[PDB]
Design an enzyme around this catalytic site. Structure first.
Site, mmCIF file in Angstrom:
data_model
loop_
_atom_site.group_PDB
_atom_site.id
_atom_site.type_symbol
_atom_site.label_atom_id
_atom_site.label_comp_id
_atom_site.label_asym_id
_atom_site.label_seq_id
_atom_site.Cartn_x
_atom_site.Cartn_y
_atom_site.Cartn_z
ATOM 1 N N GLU A 49 0.884 -1.167 0.000
ATOM 2 C CA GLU A 49 0.000 0.000 0.000
ATOM 3 C C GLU A 49 0.927 1.223 0.000
ATOM 4 O O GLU A 49 1.825 1.328 0.830
ATOM 5 C CB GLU A 49 -0.919 -0.012 1.216
ATOM 6 C CG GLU A 49 -2.113 0.920 1.064
ATOM 7 C CD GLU A 49 -3.276 0.340 0.259
ATOM 8 O OE1 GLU A 49 -4.292 1.061 0.159
ATOM 9 O OE2 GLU A 49 -3.214 -0.810 -0.251
ATOM 10 N N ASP A 60 -4.786 10.679 7.989
ATOM 11 C CA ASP A 60 -3.458 10.193 8.386
ATOM 12 C C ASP A 60 -3.156 10.620 9.839
ATOM 13 O O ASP A 60 -3.340 11.791 10.197
ATOM 14 C CB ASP A 60 -2.344 10.770 7.480
ATOM 15 C CG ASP A 60 -2.474 10.391 5.978
ATOM 16 O OD1 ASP A 60 -3.359 9.635 5.567
ATOM 17 O OD2 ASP A 60 -1.643 10.885 5.177
ATOM 18 N N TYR A 175 -10.769 -3.249 3.147
ATOM 19 C CA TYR A 175 -9.922 -2.699 4.206
ATOM 20 C C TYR A 175 -10.720 -2.740 5.496
ATOM 21 O O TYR A 175 -11.634 -1.939 5.699
ATOM 22 C CB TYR A 175 -9.455 -1.269 3.907
ATOM 23 C CG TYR A 175 -8.287 -0.776 4.745
ATOM 24 C CD1 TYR A 175 -8.418 -0.585 6.119
ATOM 25 C CD2 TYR A 175 -7.085 -0.431 4.163
ATOM 26 C CE1 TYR A 175 -7.388 -0.106 6.886
ATOM 27 C CE2 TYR A 175 -6.017 0.044 4.947
ATOM 28 C CZ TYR A 175 -6.183 0.192 6.306
ATOM 29 O OH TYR A 175 -5.147 0.669 7.098
HETATM 30 O O1 LIG Z 1 -0.563 3.249 10.377
HETATM 31 P P1 LIG Z 1 -1.350 2.036 10.842
HETATM 32 O O2 LIG Z 1 -2.028 2.262 12.181
HETATM 33 O O3 LIG Z 1 -0.559 0.734 10.798
HETATM 34 O O4 LIG Z 1 -2.557 1.852 9.777
HETATM 35 C C1 LIG Z 1 -2.235 1.760 8.392
HETATM 36 C C2 LIG Z 1 -2.655 3.066 7.746
HETATM 37 O O5 LIG Z 1 -1.842 4.113 8.293
HETATM 38 C C3 LIG Z 1 -2.531 3.078 6.216
HETATM 39 O O6 LIG Z 1 -3.204 1.952 5.652
HETATM 40 C C4 LIG Z 1 -3.109 4.385 5.829
HETATM 41 C C5 LIG Z 1 -2.349 5.513 5.570
HETATM 42 N N1 LIG Z 1 -3.227 6.538 5.323
HETATM 43 C C6 LIG Z 1 -4.521 6.141 5.435
HETATM 44 C C7 LIG Z 1 -5.748 6.774 5.293
HETATM 45 C C8 LIG Z 1 -6.934 6.048 5.470
HETATM 46 C C9 LIG Z 1 -6.917 4.692 5.806
HETATM 47 C C10 LIG Z 1 -5.714 4.010 5.965
HETATM 48 C C11 LIG Z 1 -4.537 4.712 5.797
#
Ligand SMILES: O=P(O)(O)OC[C@@H](O)[C@@H](O)c1c[nH]c2ccccc12
Ligand SMILES: O=P(O)(O)OC[C@@H](O)[C@@H](O)c1c[nH]c2ccccc12
Ligand SMILES: *Cc1c(COP(=O)(O)O)cnc(C)c1O
Ligand SMILES: *Cc1c(COP(=O)(O)O)cnc(C)c1O
Ligand code: NA
Ligand code: NA
EC number: 4.2.1.20
Lengths: 254, 394, 394, 254
Positions: A49, A60, A175
């Protein structure tokens, strides 16, 4: 889409979960980012990703916010991100590549053009973080026209109508925001396989997700913290990324 | 689905992460309920009258227009408790929060007027208030920061991004995502995701309703035009709303032209930006060719919202309202003129609206016209800004 | 002779140089004429309503009184155009000036509120305004000085004597002596020579008139007491006047106690000064054993008039009104309490009145009482003062 | 009172006007002030007008304002002023001495006590600058009880009712503010002899006043300016005061 299908079928034959790292493209620079990504893959990432730096990423957390800021300090643009993507694909023909986008960067020069560019460089999926299912029609339509999987987030506060919509509209993977019943219901509705994301930072969480019936797990902040913590030693950075991904991937195996 | 239309033509919508949708639906539902509830209306009316000081005066400015055939009235939102129109809708939104069983308030602010407004409403109504403000704005607005704190609000500096209003807006959403069960997000303008543009208009529409009653009383007819500045769109849509179906009444919105449109240093996205998707909505915005969001520039900190409310973009598109811009120097001249000729010190935001009315008058001094300018706030806050500039030029 | 009684018991009179008597008689005559003239009353009413924002709200403060049997209303003169009650009577006095054929205004000011008020009224009504201010006060009040100048007033620093309010008062008289044919002296409080104490009361009495109507509407009875701060006496007499013949209504005036009466650093001449003759009147004043006039001290610059209006001294002497004092620390505490519990930032002057109401409540929390505090002005101006003190203590 | 009567009768026998200087007591200090006053008398002053420093002299112009400030810098009090007056009287038994007072200093410890103290030290008249005829009753009554002349100002804006009151209430002299008809009317009403004051700074103004029918002229600022201008040389100060008074007095003579 097809790359995800192939992956999940392959992983299912090995009774195996997917481990999927997230990083921001061009963090901390273009070159170091390309190396990071190659290291994630070599260490055993099943898919990627990849975030395109955006000025106002309101989904974020701080860790990711700072990744964007590092990428912007390096002058990283969406155009440079698409050049990076083409090269990553040219090196690695089978690994699924998903983008994490904000709506304005998709809508900017035309929704259709954006997905056409994804198809051209070999991107497999796109999650538009600030487009809920309710607003998704033009995005999901354009994605499907260019053989790109539109990815939807299935959050905790998710009711049955939403589960049905996510199952119907999504492709590639679902997701699943950080769940056994959610997972059963998604399966009941023939949803794309679930990847659990948010707060996944340790091997036991990966095994837990697979045990709960998810097809795998996504980890971002944990990965990006390793980058943040090692900016002064790029070599140490890669080593620690290798160690972490290898451990996380091992937890996915039968 | 939703109860109300989230769009004004192509503009608006609900472009938020999925996790925020239930909060928006809940709010829309509570709003629709509240609007039919006579006890809610009575309570809101009581606060507006007995706490905020409604109705506000409609003042005829006879010195300013001398020797022309323009008759100019000012709608006196500068006389509202807190010194700006922002008070109207924070009271409504605070009452909504309580209707939903919420005990906490999150707000964003730039120049700080909305923050002070949110803090005062929260103090009055027993809500725990926390306010997000870009560190650059915190630095520039110590007086307003201190007011918020005296009123018991928690002020949280935002260092992410440009550390200005758009970044506070982002952080405010980030928080609500996780706390919406007990906290209401008190958005400060007629923008953002549905239902906010609708709610904010409806909780500001008394501006235009009073203006209509008052102008009919004093002149026996409707205005030729009503004129208001446009940062995000709240004071302007509050003035405009009750006149939309009065086809003879011109609706003129004034965006900040900063150092001049041609300089690129301005805050006029509606007429000179490009449609994008950000902060929960599809609307004209200040953005790079690449689609990164940029800052609005104006002498007035309060006109710094880098986009504009979707209903304005729609009213423009169909030709019902016209939008123009006014430069820093034109706004400054209008500020000085009002002080000297009428003994009213206008907010620099509102001075943009006044400046355009002054242009309409001066450009065509034998044109008979009846104009109302929404004087969205008082300018006591802008004395130091105006002092320093006038000092820097001599 | 005069048309009206220049005395309230022993207090008041016309202790000016002989050369000023014709100016005072002229003014008294014009006032008496104006008071019977329905066109004058209509014009004054129109300005008050449509320019100044009358009537002002009467706000019930339910958070402040929680757990006690006190019900507390605030008369919201903070919502008046200009942010203080001073606006009411400058409009009346400006109209009088025009009735007498005068084209010029002379005013004195201390903290600067009356100066700003005089400048705004003069701007509106086409009068040439010049303002005298002690150099020490000019230094302390740059914001208000700059407001006066934006509104086209000429501000003249006074270096004679202590270079404070009493010295500006002297210089204002010096000037009028020589220019009264074309200039009116717009005295800023209910003090000085007859007819000023009478004129100022009559041009502030709408405060009490509105309060009475409003309290009858909302509570069906008159207040147990009405409470107001006393610098020179204008806001207090404006609140009190309409209730004087309502024997059941207590009238409580609050003088500044500064660092404490026993310290000698206070501004409470009515209760702790000595009767003298100065500034055109016989009244209690701050003076040495020898009879030299001294300064009033208060945390609030606006309570610095070193004497008090003669009608207050009279109302005290006969027992119709009671006067008390409140210290700097008590006023500061009341300021903080109102901000946090009601979302209203009060002037530090008005905070003295509030503080005494808070004492009445807290001292006897099961005493049932209905109190009205005259909130004579807003406290945006006092933010820096309160900031620095709170900073100096930590 | 009686000293003025005697003076004006004496001056009338010599077809002569009075020249009357004003100074502030204790300006620039007690000693220098006593010397100043002795010099004014030696140079030919017919009478004296003497100011007691007051905090807020709202009828004094800048020159006089500054005299008060100098006197206050020297710590001059009303008590010290009365000690000065007693000594001036002890040196000079016939010269009329008038005080220029502000109401608060008279009213402070009792109006009666004030005039009794004037009588004790040998003061002849008192002009209370901020007491108009309308407010004068207690002052003029107390003055007459202690054989002190109450002095009233007859300003330019003076109507017939005022002329009659000033004529009836005043004694010693009438202070005629800077006029032939005013002078005739005052004479018609048997007013105290007129002394013209305000802006008298040159010999020709003294002769003009006498020619117009006034009994003399008062000069203050002109005198006090000489003090202000010579603070650094007390000897030069006296010399210039002597020169000025001698010239002004000479202009009064037939
Ligand atoms: O950082 P984490 O807690 O491991 O979760 C992944 C997430 O940050 C990544 O998939 C992601 C980055 N930006 C996003 C915006 C929306 C959903 C998800 C995301
Ligand atoms: O200074 P001049 O212009 O010469 O005027 C004498 C005057 O100053 C003196 O008589 C005086 C001093 N203080 C006063 C107050 C009132 C009237 C007169 C006076
Ligand atoms: C905040 C502010 C504005 C601009 O916001 P809108 O939502 O466009 O009204 C205008 N005037 C004042 C006084 C403000 O405080
Ligand atoms: C000037 C002022 C006062 C004090 O003067 P009063 O004549 O006693 O009313 C009180 N409150 C405010 C807000 C003032 O400006
Ligand atoms: Na904008
Ligand atoms: Na006082």
């Amino acid at each position: 889409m097809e790359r995800y299908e192939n992956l999940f079928a392959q992983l299912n034959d090995r009774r195996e979960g997917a481990f999927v790292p997230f990083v921001t493209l061009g963090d901390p620079g273009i070159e170091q980012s390309l190396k990071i990504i190659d290291t994630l893959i070599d260490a055993g990432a099943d898919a990627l990703e990849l975030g395109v730096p955006f000025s106002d990423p309101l989904a974020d957390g701080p860790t990711i916010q700072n990744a964007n800021l590092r990428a912007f300090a390096a002058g990283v643009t969406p155009a440079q991100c698409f050049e990076m993507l083409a090269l990553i694909r040219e090196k690695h023909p089978t690994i699924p590549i998903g983008l994490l986008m904000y709506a304005n960067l998709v809508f900017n020069n035309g929704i259709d053009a954006f997905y056409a560019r994804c198809e051209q460089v070999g991107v497999d999926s796109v999650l538009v973080a600030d487009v809920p299912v309710e607003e998704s029609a033009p995005f999901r339509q354009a994605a499907l026209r260019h053989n790109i999987a539109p990815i939807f987030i299935c959050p905790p506060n998710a009711d049955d109508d939403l589960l049905r919509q996510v199952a119907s509209y999504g492709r590639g993977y679902t997701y699943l925001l950080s769940l056994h019943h959610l997972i059963e219901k998604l399966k009941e509705y023939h949803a794309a396989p679930a990847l659990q994301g948010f707060g996944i930072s340790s091997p036991e969480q990966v095994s837990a997700a697979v045990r709960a019936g998810a097809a795998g797990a996504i980890s971002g902040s944990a990965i990006v913290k390793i980058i943040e913590k090692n900016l002064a030693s790029p070599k140490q950075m890669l080593a620690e990324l290798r160690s972490f991904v290898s451990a996380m991937k091992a937890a996915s195996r039968a | 689905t939703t109860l109300l239309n989230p769009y004004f033509g192509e503009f608006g919508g609900m472009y938020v992460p999925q996790i925020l949708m239930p909060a928006l639906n809940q709010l829309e539902e509570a709003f629709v309920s509240a609007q039919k509830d006579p006890e809610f209306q009575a309570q809101f009316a009581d606060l507006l009258k007995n706490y905020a000081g409604r109705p506000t005066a409609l003042t005829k400015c006879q010195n300013i227009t001398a020797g022309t055939r323009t008759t100019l009235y000012l709608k006196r939102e500068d006389l509202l408790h807190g010194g700006a129109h922002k008070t109207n809708q924070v009271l409504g939104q605070a009452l909504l929060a309580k209707r939903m069983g919420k005990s906490e308030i999150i707000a964003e602010t730039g120049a700080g007027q909305h923050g002070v407004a949110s803090a005062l409403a929260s103090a009055l109504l027993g809500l725990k208030c926390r306010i997000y403000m870009g560190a650059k704005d915190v630095e520039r607005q110590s007086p307003n920061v201190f007011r918020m704190r005296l009123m018991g609000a928690e002020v949280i500096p935002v260092h992410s991004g440009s550390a200005t209003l758009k970044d506070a807006c982002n952080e405010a959403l980030r928080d609500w995502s996780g706390s919406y069960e007990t906290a209401h997000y008190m958005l400060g303008t007629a923008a953002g995701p549905h239902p906010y543009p609708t709610i904010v208009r409806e909780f500001q529409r008394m501006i235009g309703e009073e203006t209509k009653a008052q102008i009919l009383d004093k002149e026996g007819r409707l205005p030729d035009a009503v004129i208001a500045c446009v940062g995000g769109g709240s004071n302007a849509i509050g003035m405009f709303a009750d006149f939309i179906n009065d086809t003879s009444v011109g609706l003129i919105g004034v965006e900040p032209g900063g150092h001049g449109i041609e300089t690129g240093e301005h805050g006029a996205p509606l007429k000179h930006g490009r449609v994008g998707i950000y902060f929960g909505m599809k609307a004209p915005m200040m953005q790079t060719a690449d689609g990164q969001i940029e800052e609005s520039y104006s002498i007035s900190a309060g006109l710094d919202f880098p986009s504009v409310g979707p209903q304005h973009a729609y009213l423009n598109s169909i030709g019902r309202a016209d939008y123009v811009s006014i430069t820093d120097d034109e706004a400054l001249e209008a500020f000085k003129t009002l002080c000297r000729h009428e003994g009213i010190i206008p907010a620099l935001e509102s001075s943009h609206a006044l400046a355009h009315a002054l242009k309409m008058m001066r450009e065509q001094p034998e044109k008979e016209q009846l104009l109302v300018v929404n004087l969205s706030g008082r300018g006591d806050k802008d004395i130091f800004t105006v002092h320093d500039i006038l000092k820097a030029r001599g």
